[PDB]
Amino acid sequence: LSGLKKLIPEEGRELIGSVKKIIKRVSNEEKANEMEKNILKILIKVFFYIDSKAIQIGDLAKVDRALRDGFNHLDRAFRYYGVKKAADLVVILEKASTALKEAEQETVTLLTPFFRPHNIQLIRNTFAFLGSLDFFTKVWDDLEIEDDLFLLISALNKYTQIELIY
Ligand SMILES: CCCCCCCCCCCCCCCC(=O)OC[C@H](COP(=O)(O)OCCN)OC(=O)CCCCCCCCCCCCCCC
Ligand code: NA
């Protein structure tokens, strides 16, 4: 995992660290390690084919928008984190989940010419876990304040209005 991590900067590594800690808290260390590796693998591949120009920046638009939508809805729901129960926030969290499903599909479409079918399934499983409404509701109801959802959302919500990759 050394090289994959030196292929993304400190900012991204901190984002992935926050996600990984939350995943640890909601499931287990094995799933957290698998999801960290999967996120790194998908990211590294996308960046690789952007840089080699096998993928054009315009082709990324669909994923970009979807991700930002997802982030935005999480930000909206995070406004009520600690003052409303997750059941009262499903209408927001569902939209986040749906947005990430869109990102999932488009990432699959983006990487089909370059990923073996097993790694396409890896994309599906990774996005399905990270974008799961069950994951979100568990996070919004059952986390301690020390689990630092604030760090993740407060890092994500800076990116909702500007293209993620340009
Ligand atoms: C698994 C998802 C894979 C999606 C792959 C396709 C889309 C890729 C686009 C990624 C853009 C991210 C930029 C962010 C800033 C940054 O960190 O930017 C540094 C590098 C890129 O920098 P650059 O030099 O390219 O700059 C670009 C031009 N300025 O980004 C990264 O390290 C990616 C880090 C991603 C970590 C995501 C973790 C959360 C995702 C799921 C949400 C789960 C919520 C859980 C709620 C409890
Ligand atoms: Na796209």
Report on the structure:
- The protein is globular and about 45 Å long.
- Helix content is 70%, strand content 0%.
- The relative contact order is 0.17.
- It has helices at 2-6, 10-26, 29-51, 61-78, 90-111, 117-130, 133-142, 149-156.
- The protein is an all-alpha fold.
- It has eight helices and no strands.
- The chain has one domain (1-166).
- The site of di-palmitoyl-3-SN-phosphatidylethanolamine (PEF) has 22 residues, from helix 2, helix 3, helix 4 and helix 6.
- It is classed as protein binding.
- Keywords: alpha helix, lipid binding, G-protein binding, social amoebae, chemotaxis, protein binding.
- The assembly is monomeric.
Any descriptors?
166 residues, 70% helix, binds sodium ion, binds di-palmitoyl-3-SN-phosphatidylethanolamine, mainly alpha
